[PDB]
Symmetry: D2
Subunit: 279 residues, 4 copies
């Protein structure tokens, strides 16, 4: 009878390398641990979604204002109606009678450059401009001469004297709670220049969240500059938008299943057919 | 120094249970093997996609007519235009500039009961009717009194003197090549009864493919009745539709990328907003 | 627009920025005294006041100060002290203007002789900058244009130090020729790099010590603010003497500078009872002339205009500013608000009138108590909706509002408001039917209007061949050719567009003022483009002169900036000219006529379109050359074209105040070059009746001399033989009389009226009119993105945050459309917190980690993990809730439920743990259970599940309530025991999968954390080891 | 009563732009049309999966050898065992009892740069080298000096005297049937240089398929150079790999459901836990 692998490991007789590494959650043991913190201690220390997210995404005990800011970001990105690409896809999959997971996933797969990536894009653009040391006017001119529109700038209806009211809540929280907001100040200077061009070139929710998240990361004491830069590069802000919008997509799925909408077919009048004469 | 796991396994001193089982493909070894059959021999037997699918899905060497019929089924399910739910979702995800895999997956997640499940549904319905021993008229009456529509029956415009033209090719192939078609004959009797009701209640491409696939499975010598029943139960026909329509979904993605279509946002005039007064 | 700056500001800029080898004296050595200044403070911040003698003169843009006794010389500190108060803060009358003395300047006295009184002036012209120098300057300068040395410096030409001693310094003293020339060169550099348009130093004194600038009058191109921002700093533009500045004027000026639209407001008489809301500079000018033609000049309160398609918000801000200004004092006779305008070309009348009516609703109180009567005349895009909403506000507020449309002559609401009428080389042919244009910028509405015009004109091909937009990649844009759908290419670069479309001969530049110069300069590098239309307003005059010089060199016709463009009925239309297709059909601009016109204004050009269509055969060609000081092409440039064009039979010129341009037409008629009948009216006659120097909306609308007044121009044209109406009222009649007398002689043979091709109505317009019915394909009840504020299930987002709900409250709103209690929202949050992650070994976390190590993506990795959420993994929440709800609703006791599940071969969902049984519980079940038992009002299903747990643990210890079981039963309890849901609603939510949603949303946090962890650790591609896979392939299939 | 939108469109009284464009399939009409070509004629010309794929992906009537080569590419990319990332994910999702679509989709979402993207990577890399005009030795040295491995080069065990036997089949077909193989000849020259280094750097199946697909696109008469370049840029080879491996992923799902494997949990001994001491 051959030696039992588990019982050989128990005596430490053999060496089998572990193929996986994790640092965010320990399920083994008498107590569940979130990045070194017991779940009961998680609940006595009175964090919520923001604190749990800080533990699970950054392995940090964020300050209460940081945790609350993360919560508000999730609340403001929760939904933006059924007409966007992801909500449209989720509704189509729900009306196909498919599944909650399948419908939400179908909607989420649209999250990318054109839809839902402006948070990360604005964060990266403003961070690069701030770190290069160029002044906001030079940054605006450089984007204009490079044929690029500033990510996180520009609104559809709302302008100066017609505040977004989602940007205002987050901005007011950031000014009254964050210790320092250098990148937010830089982005506000850029916004002043762009609104001097045409009124609706205001800081978006995407731009506000991106710059405020970068400011939180590199101005709260939990992260070094390298850590904050790495998290921005690997996509913590993409994760923020995805987690926020999943709430709205699940709401849309539940809405369609309660309304008991049937299978959707796109009308032919809305499709232009440009097939070749004969291939 | 503790003993090496791999080298202790080579000496056969320890026992570690394998957590996975597979029977369709052997990647290791001098030659790639598809269900016991070398890849060079796969190409020497001049089989194609249908034969490779037979190997990889059923671990069987199907006859040439069976493999050719599988190929024709994939050919006829390849696409049905951009208005269906899956193609719509794929096009939305492509116009969001996302990715080929993400776009195709977004479209594929709609494949289920209401869209793309009629193949399996019709196969199961007709198999159950044929196995229960009831005549086609009794089957029609039982479905009528149970408040269920016969899946795989009923077209939109093409009824008679103008058939599906996709049902016709497949039915002609099955007639000329399949040895016996008991469930197909049963489905055709059901179709005669339903067309005696109103002309457009004809055997759909979904119904024809489902009944002909059950016929191929349980009338070619490769499978026993239990095996054919198990394959129908676990979803070989869902697999057939998914694989066939993947070709069309990828074509739709490539078409949108070539046409360079921008981000789609659903018009507000097409959405009815029925939010509550204040919640 | 050239704005005069104060002497202090000009001297400060000169001292700060001039670069001369000459030792400029008294640098930053001047004193400003005002009534609100402290003399001790000035004495201790400017000590030279005691060091030398003084000179004092006001700095309120008063000229001729020497001979009106406003300047005091050779008087000390005590002298200026005794000298100011008898004049400081007093009343002075210069010309027709009178005003206070709130600003004075004190400078050192310069001891100088009459032999060193020099005059140096630099002023801008179309062909360049003229530099005048006089050796006998000062008071005795006399005539300057005939006795002072003149020297033109052309556009893009440097004023070299030589040729100044040759042309400008013939009579200069030899001992001071060199330093004088150096100073003049430095002064020209100062003039050119700070975008001065006028710079007169009189007198200039140069002693052995150095050069003294005793005085200077300077006008600066205010539109160049975006260029000279750091050099000007906070440059201020004083109002003309006799006018006091107002915060409302400053607010409107800031609003105007903040956008590409035009917003002008000038307060002439705050006590006046006539107020105007006129769209368009030319329309505002003609309304002003009409008001002062009926004797309302004394009661005219403001001159104002809004142009450039202002937004709803901008129009609201403008309207509310004027409404607040109108509701300050009270007039016994009441007050009048003239909301006028021409027929707009592209200004959204609906949006602008929505802004105005919002302001009217906001001020309906003071407006009603002020007896304000509103007269409205307007036409343009969507004017029916705007007239409708203003009429509605007129009754929903009580304000007497009389709205009229195009059928009114637009100089009629003035008559019925003031109580006078009852209230009811360069080519000749720029465009043809084969003209192809390239549009710079995304102007899809403008391009579509162009295509609609081409279709109703029976053109073979669309007039727009390509579009250029540098902020996107090359693609094809979808447009309408009648009812057919066509694709128009869009290019990132000019070069690609001109490469692929060599047949294009016209550019329509929709670039802003900051991009128009560069785009036009780049455009004139292609010889195929023969006409460029520049739409942007606010381009600096120096840049426009550069464009003019290059276009003249290249033989390219430029339809000057700040123009709507032009229209040639039957052949071609520039941009938004002529408005939308309904106006094109109303003015019959799809077919040629015989009257060609040139105008400065665009809206006035649409008015001309309407008038000519009504009174004559029609329009052959109409060009608006723009309101800028230097148009790309002038009046004569187009009148010559029309005279040389055989299809036109009479010419209509709509001139303006300022610029001796109509005198060229007079000379052309005198020399016999112009022979066809010409009908001209020059607008701006009210400036002669205004006791001030008000600047109109147009940049060029400024009478610099006495011959550039509109009255003088109209008189000169009348003596030249041009048919000149008595006013803009009689323009239609004189055009009609000329057309009739030209028809009766057989000169004009009107053609048959062939009906135009029909264009289908737009779907959006038909929906707005409620003409058609299209069922909505989608239904939503959870979020309303449209509107001013985002709404989550009927409750605004600001209210969401003010009520202090968090994720739990937002989730209640978005998932159930209920305002859940605080404990319910908090419990939802804790459920999400406890389902957040359970390590990397579960199926979903494993799949997510695999996809992350495949280097894939956050969304793809999370989605790969989420697709495992189902029956075997992640579905125990819903399964336990459904099982326990069914058992509890069946009425069977927990023991019966346990026996039943045992006899059906089913394990109880949500029962059974791995290690933690009793005396050591889950520590997650405990937290949630303690919260539920402390905050939930009633927990019947939780009590039932606890009884079931008591039996299962009577069987074996680890059969305890799981986190899944406890969350399921507690969620059902919350749904059906908080007051928000009925039993049917709670059952439906449980059936459709709210608990599946809870688990999915909770575990998404852990899956994203796992993805980020793998990316931080930089784990490579995973491959499952072969020793862990059992291969059971058949022997040979 | 307002006019019906469909009635107003039929009368041509209103204009509503179509928000979607398609050029690959016409579902409306008496017959289904694949890129301008009727389905009955599709089956009459005796093309199969390869011809249908040519129609749906490129809107071209490819030559018979091109269609057959596309079929062989799909056949050789069908499966490579259960150990790869996508098959592993599919097997996990199937053992979670989930669904065919969900399981296949879970496996497919791994298709990207590290897994399954070598086809497109090799095609793009060799195309750039061939178009730049540098000789194979210069290309090899250039990739060496930029510290990049040549995509499509390098095998695990099979180098010479025992080649891949999939590369051999595809290469023999390409040599016998393709009119010209310039990029293939270039890649074989590169492979000779790399095998002069040590034998195991041979032309991979990924490299062979990439270069042979580029050769087919730009050497069959159906495409111009711009068209072939655009198709390679937008991801026809990614589509080829995805469609080929979907058959293997569905086979793996069906295999797991036939073997009735339970829920998988990764062993704790294979995971290294590196959580922080206390966050
Ligand atoms: C997530 C965020 O907060 S923003 C995300 C993007 N972030 C960026 O900053 C991207 C960079 N910035 C930009 O490119 C631009 O400034 C934009 C796109 C953000 C600004 O958008 P705009 O082009 O001004 O307007 P948008 O394209 O959203 O709206 C199109 C028009 O159709 C209308 N419209 C919008 N959605 C719909 C709909 N579903 N149905 C019908 N009409 C609609 C709107 O009224 C709008 O009209 P208007 O803009 O002329 O008033
Ligand atoms: C898609 C394709 O065709 S390959 C991708 C193409 N990309 C490129 O070609 C880019 C450049 N090429 C490369 O990166 C490299 O040449 C590779 C990765 C393709 C070749 O890698 P190699 O290190 O030569 O082989 P690989 O990493 O696949 O396998 C290494 C060894 O592990 C063994 N092995 C492979 N998979 C497993 C498994 N699941 N369990 C246990 N052992 C395994 C192999 O037998 C091989 O054995 P050896 O030690 O006797 O050589
Ligand atoms: C979401 C939830 O709350 S769980 C789902 C709830 N659903 C139900 O309640 C359904 C009914 N209940 C049941 O089916 C059962 O009671 C279960 C599955 C919940 C409990 O099953 P058990 O057999 O007690 O434990 P489980 O199957 O989890 O694993 C048992 C052993 O595997 C070991 N194990 C678990 N995970 C791993 C891993 N990743 N690696 C190695 N070993 C492991 C444990 O150490 C345990 O050993 P022990 O029993 O000697 O301590
Ligand atoms: O094929 C049909 O007729 C039904 C259909 O649109 C699809 O599900 O593909
Ligand atoms: O939470 C548990 O105990 C069971 C588990 O692993 C999961 O589904 O996440």
């Amino acid at each position: 009878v051959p030696m039992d692998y588990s019982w050989a490991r128990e005596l430490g007789l053999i060496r089998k390398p572990a193929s996986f590494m994790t640092s965010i959650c320990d399920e083994r043991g008498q107590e569940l641990i979130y990045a070194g913190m017991p779940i009961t201690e998680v609940f006595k220390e009175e964090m919520g979604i923001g604190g749990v997210l800080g533990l699970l995404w950054f392995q940090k005990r964020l300050p209460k204002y940081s945790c609350q800011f993360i919560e508000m970001c999730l609340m403001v990105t929760a939904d933006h109606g059924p007409a966007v690409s992801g909500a449209h896809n989720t509704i189509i999959c729900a009306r196909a009678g498919k599944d909650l997971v399948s419908s939400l996933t179908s909607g989420l797969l649209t999250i990318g450059d054109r839809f839902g990536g402006a948070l990360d894009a604005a964060a990266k653009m403003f961070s690069k401009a701030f770190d290069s040391g160029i002044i906001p006017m030079e940054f605006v001119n450089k984007m204009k001469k490079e044929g690029k529109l500033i990510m996180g700038i520009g609104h559809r209806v709302k302008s100066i004297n017609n505040p977004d009211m989602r940007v205002q809540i987050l901005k007011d929280y950031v000014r009254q709670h964050f210790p320092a907001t250098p990148l937010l100040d830089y982005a506000l200077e850029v916004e002043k220049i762009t609104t001097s061009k045409k009124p609706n070139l205001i800081l978006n929710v995407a731009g506000l969240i991106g710059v405020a998240f970068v400011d939180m990361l590199r101005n709260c004491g939990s992260f070094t500059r390298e850590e904050a830069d790495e998290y921005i590069d690997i996509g913590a802000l993409n994760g923020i938008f995805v987690l926020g919008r999943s709430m709205g997509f699940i709401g849309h799925y539940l809405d369609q299943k309660r309304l008991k909408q049937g299978l959707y077919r796109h009308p032919w009048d809305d499709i232009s057919y440009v097939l070749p004469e004969h291939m």
